[PDB]
Symmetry: none
Subunit: 152 residues, 2 copies
Amino acid sequence: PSPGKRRMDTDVIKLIESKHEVTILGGLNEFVVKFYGPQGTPYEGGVWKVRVDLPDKYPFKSPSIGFMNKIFHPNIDEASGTVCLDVINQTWTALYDLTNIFESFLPQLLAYPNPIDPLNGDAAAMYLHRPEEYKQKIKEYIQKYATEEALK
Amino acid sequence: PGKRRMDTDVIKLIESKHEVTILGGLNEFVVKFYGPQGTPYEGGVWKVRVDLPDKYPFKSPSIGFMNKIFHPNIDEASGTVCLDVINQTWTALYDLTNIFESFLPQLLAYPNPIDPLNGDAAAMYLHRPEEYKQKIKEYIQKYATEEALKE
Ligand code: NA
């Protein structure tokens, strides 16, 4: 097995053993993690199933990250749930710790979006101009799509 | 009243020496901003985007550098100025001309010790001031001259 493949297995097992709750799909290159909205943000209270796919060229190429249940955020395509790959790539390196996607990358993205060049223009505009509507829109999406109730 | 303040604060900024481009409306615009004399930013040129929230001026503007800048309280990738740092200076009677005449030059002269948005910039500022200045100089030449802005 390649250095890249050895890293995939080691990385994913490391992630499985972490505090993060992992469900494996087709194999170790596709898993889903239960992710909780960060405290002190409009996402607080939300629960999401975040799917991660690892490319064959991992870890040189970054994982792709998608929210399987709906989220409203300037840098996440609403209809697909896909996190902006340019944003992931600003953080990702060949030695970046996969567990930090959940501990560090995603909490910080949700807390502090980049509303310039957004994947969700609606969310970006509200973020910048109507922060109270932005927060309320997120709270409504949480109640409709991102509670334990909604997920079952 | 707040909206009356938005319209007149923006029109005053338009009337001032500061060069303003309006984007979607009076609540979003870009101002051409020159690095303050006697700081490591001296000589740099930036396009600074300001967005005004509906409850302005009770709520502060958000402020982003549209071409790259290296500073502890500014997120390098997005150009976003730390909103907590903005809020420490913002009041309901603060206006827009002072964002450019007072707030931003004082911030570029004196980074704020609030948890940094640029950790690399904070570490250099604090422990390697000479490398901090050199890196800013390099970023200015690369991202923040009139020529770099044309491109
Ligand atoms: Na003007």
